[PDB]
């Protein structure tokens, strides 16, 4: 399945995802798409794919995409988390950590494109999580880059860490929320189990966990050292040693073998397929699995991966190529 | 489990292909994580003796790298008294997932054969190796025959 | 028992341990919450270094006690 | 659906609430659970403040979704 989703209720794991589109304002399934799209970059952004809304008191041209869980049946307030990076391992690429072919595979947003078996991705986040070695951005958040050695290649999705789970992601939320405060400009308070973000005067060294019912609760701590409050000073600090620039060591050979498009190039015949009804070669141009079988005689809509005639299940399950 | 998938492919490769300097690879059947090996120095003054190493690959592998612990006293200013060589490639702050262990041994043995006092641990040995090249040679002659293991037969 | 631990640049914490428990255990616990390698943790107490094998009972530490954690920033 | 109202200081509340239930309902329920009124309690969800008329529908929140609770302070 091209679309995978995370389903709370009662799946708790990466399911198939049934892609549907609706109107922006009225929000029904009465939409006329101009084009029926190429990639997750269409579907993830609000107000990209636009067309014509059918049911007639509704002039909102732009549409809204939503993903549902493709295993057991659902109702409308179900909206599952769309996993846009992770597709099935159709081309059969190895993991860059481990010479193993497993399905499906994560694809990081990096330039040469690096992919991975699933169980490593649990290991990669948590070893970074235990050690604290993520990359925190102001706008995006507290995420990891590409694993091989790729600059400017962060995953743009907090909800992908829900594959790690309600235990780990909540811990990720605590460590992430702490990670923002140093970059914003604060310190975590040193009382055991309090963590009060408090703002005293500049001049006053003695700051106290003060509040009442919540927050403040009996601890006067020194500003520089964070001890019980005193007049003079504490002992001296340790020498610092700057790293500053760090050439991240990448493996040449394994990075070749961990490429999503090639690595070794198994899928070669994926360009022209014999259509059943007509019996003619037709070329697949770009993203769309949905291909029109482009003959004066024929005129027929058929799916590339399936082969049979284009229906809403083939629309929903795997609309576009991954 | 994961490291066992990792390392049995590597252990078959490194024993079959053979690192030549690195010899006497004592690896356990059940205990895959501990690898012991006898490195053979070729440059003076370490080729007078021979040094054993025990690389302890941890539970989380290969996300965290192992610690190459020597079970040998060696007269060399990177490595300390107990058994902790200082290696740039085995680092936490700088690490790649796709690291070959023989690549670390290529890092290690070149480090053993060519002494770095630019990034050492011990102060007087790094002081001595930078300042008095003869005396560090002379002490390493006396040290390594006394402490280090014998030269092999092949 | 409740103990405070101190760092180089300000941030003091606590950690739940006993007299019996091990410093390699406690560095694992501080590695759990704080986010530092046991390789890069230098615990000092009363002008003395805390060993990974050695324990809080040997060094003799009670509740309401501070551990001076010096940081390794060149881990190499 | 279970929500984790994770406050700033440590402790977090578990509450059985729908998308249909509002913040004014949850301020009643958190007042039931802990014992703090609607006027003191301030709900926020990742920056944006939660208001009394708006709901878990408008702010768009699911089961296992972490809200924050900030407390107003009366009389200095
Ligand atoms: Zn589901
Ligand atoms: Zn409409
Ligand atoms: Zn893998
Ligand atoms: Zn990459
Ligand atoms: Zn407090
Ligand atoms: Zn003090
Ligand atoms: Zn045809
Ligand atoms: Zn089909």
From Swiss-Prot, chain A:
Documented activity regulation? In the autoinhibited state the side chain of Phe-320 inserts into a hydrophobic groove in RING-0, occluding the ubiquitin acceptor site Cys-288, whereas the REP repressor element binds RING-1 and blocks its E2-binding site.
Question: Which positions bind Zn(2+) 1?
Answer: 95, 98, 117, 120
Principal place of residence: cytoplasm
Going by the record, the broad EC class of this enzyme is transferase
**ZnF bounds (RING-type):** 1-82, 95-150, 275-306
Residue numbers spanned by region TRIAD supradomain = 91-322
Zinc finger regions typed IBR-type: which residues? 170-234
Which Gene Ontology terms of cellular component type are present?
A: aggresome; cytoplasm; cytosol; dopaminergic synapse; endoplasmic reticulum; endoplasmic reticulum membrane; glutamatergic synapse; Golgi apparatus
Q: Which residues carry this modification: Phosphothreonine?
A: 32, 74
Effect annotated for changing residue 113 to C: In PARK2 and PARK; uncertain significance; impairs the ability to ubiquitinate SNCAIP and ZNF746; decreased binding to the TP53 promoter; abolishes TP53 transcriptional repression
Q: Where is this region: SYT11 binding 2?
A: 114-150
The impact of changing residue 185 to E is:
In PARK2; does not affect PINK-1 dependent localization to depolarized mitochondria
Q: Spell out the subcellular localization from the entry.
A: Cytoplasm, Cytosol; Nucleus; Endoplasmic reticulum; Mitochondrion
What changing residue 168 to R does, per the record, is: In a patient with Parkinson disease; uncertain significance
What does the UniProt record tell us about how this protein is modified after translation? ISGylated. Conjugated to ubiquitin-like protein ISG15 upon IFN-beta stimulation. ISGylation positively regulates its E3 ligase activity. Auto-ubiquitinates in an E2-dependent manner leading to its own degradation. Also polyubiquitinated by RNF41 for proteasomal degradation.
Work out whether the entry's keyword set contains Transcription regulation: yes
**Outcome of swapping residue 49 to V:** In PARK2; uncertain significance
The metabolic or biological pathway listed in the UniProt record of this protein is: Protein modification; protein ubiquitination
| EC number, UniProt record | 2.3.2.31
Q: What is the effect of changing residue 222 to S?
A: Impairs protein folding
Give the source species. Answer: Homo sapiens
Curated annotation (Swiss-Prot), chain B:
Q: Which residues form the signal peptide?
A: none
Q: Which UniProt keywords apply?
A: Acetylation, ATP-binding, Cytoplasm, Nucleotide-binding, Nucleus, Transcription, Transcription regulation, Transferase, Ubl conjugation, Ubl conjugation pathway
EC number(s) stated in the UniProt entry for this protein: 2.3.2.23
| N6-acetyllysine modified-residue sites | 131
- The superkingdom listed in its UniProt entry is Eukaryota
Outcome after substituting residue 93 to R: Decrease in autoubiquitination
Q: Where in the cell is it found?
A: Nucleus; Cytoplasm
InterPro entries referenced in this protein's UniProt entry, alphabetically? Ub_conjugating_enzyme, UBQ-conjugat_E2_core, UBQ-conjugating_AS, UBQ-conjugating_enzyme/RWD
What tissues has this protein been observed in?
Ubiquitous, with highest expression in testis.
Cellular component aspect of the GO annotation: cytoplasm; cytosol; nucleoplasm; nucleus; ubiquitin ligase complex
Effect ascribed to mutating residue 119 to D: Does not convert into a lysine reactive E2
Post-translational modification as stated in the protein's UniProt record: Ubiquitinated. The alteration of UBE2L3 protein levels during the S-phase of the cell cycle is due to ubiquitin-dependent proteasomal degradation. Autoubiquitinated in vitro.
> Know the name of this protein?
Ubiquitin-conjugating enzyme E2 L3
* Enzyme's top EC category: transferase
Reaction(s) catalysed by this chain, per the record, are: S-ubiquitinyl-[E1 ubiquitin-activating enzyme]-L-cysteine + [E2 ubiquitin-conjugating enzyme]-L-cysteine = [E1 ubiquitin-activating enzyme]-L-cysteine + S-ubiquitinyl-[E2 ubiquitin-conjugating enzyme]-L-cysteine
Similarity remark: Belongs to the ubiquitin-conjugating enzyme family.
**Active site, per annotation:** 86 (glycyl thioester intermediate)
All copies of the UBC core domain together span: 2-149
Q: In which pathway does it act?
A: Protein modification; protein ubiquitination
From Swiss-Prot, chain C:
Site Essential for function: give positions: 68
Q: What is the effect of changing residue 65 to D?
A: Phosphomimetic mutant that binds and activates PRKN
As stated in the Swiss-Prot or TrEMBL entry, residues carrying the post-translational modification (Microbial infection) ADP-ribosylthreonine are 66
Q: Which residues carry this modification: Phosphoserine?
A: 65
**Cross-link for Glycyl lysine isopeptide (Lys-Gly) (interchain with G-Cter in ubiquitin), residue positions:** 6, 11, 27, 29, 33, 48, 63
Q: Which residues form the Ubiquitin-like domain?
A: 1-76
| Residues where ADP-ribosylglycine is found | 76
Covalent cross-link Glycyl lysine isopeptide (Gly-Lys) (interchain with K-? in acceptor proteins) as placed by the record, residue numbers: 76
Q: Where does it localize?
A: Cytoplasm; Nucleus; Mitochondrion outer membrane
Function field: Exists either covalently attached to another protein, or free (unanchored). When covalently bound, it is conjugated to target proteins via an isopeptide bond either as a monomer (monoubiquitin), a polymer linked via different Lys residues of the ubiquitin (polyubiquitin chains) or a linear polymer linked via the initiator Met of the ubiquitin (linear polyubiquitin chains).
This chain belongs to which protein, by name?
Answer: Ubiquitin
Residue window of the full protein shown? 1 to 76 of 229
Swiss-Prot record, chain D:
Substitution effect: residue 74 to G:
No effect on ADP-ribosylation
| Recorded consequence of changing residue 7 to D | Impairs ubiquitination by CRL2(KLHDC3) E3 ligase complex
Q: Which residues carry this modification: Phosphoserine?
A: 65
Where does this polypeptide localize? Cytoplasm; Nucleus; Mitochondrion outer membrane
Effect noted on mutating residue 72 to K: No effect on ADP-ribosylation
Q: What membrane topology term does the record carry?
A: Peripheral membrane protein
Q: Where is this site: Interacts with activating enzyme?
A: 54, 72
Essential for function (site feature) positions: 68
Q: What is the effect of changing residue 54 to D?
A: Decreases affinity for UBE2R2 in CRL2(FEM1C)-UBE2R2 complex
Q: Where is this cross-link: Glycyl lysine isopeptide (Lys-Gly) (interchain with G-Cter in ubiquitin)?
A: 6, 11, 27, 29, 33, 48, 63
Phenotypic consequence of residue 76 to D = Impairs ubiquitination by CRL2(KLHDC3) and CRL2(KLHDC10) E3 ligase complex
Q: How is it modified after translation?
A: Phosphorylated at Ser-65 by PINK1 during mitophagy. Phosphorylated ubiquitin specifically binds and activates parkin (PRKN), triggering mitophagy. Phosphorylation does not affect E1-mediated E2 charging of ubiquitin but affects discharging of E2 enzymes to form polyubiquitin chains. It also affects deubiquitination by deubiquitinase enzymes such as USP30.
Q: Where is this cross-link: Glycyl lysine isopeptide (Gly-Lys) (interchain with K-? in acceptor proteins)?
A: 76
Q: What does this protein do?
A: Exists either covalently attached to another protein, or free (unanchored). When covalently bound, it is conjugated to target proteins via an isopeptide bond either as a monomer (monoubiquitin), a polymer linked via different Lys residues of the ubiquitin (polyubiquitin chains) or a linear polymer linked via the initiator Met of the ubiquitin (linear polyubiquitin chains).
Name the chain's protein. Answer: Ubiquitin
* The species this protein was found in: Homo sapiens
| Whole-protein residues included | 1 to 76 of 685
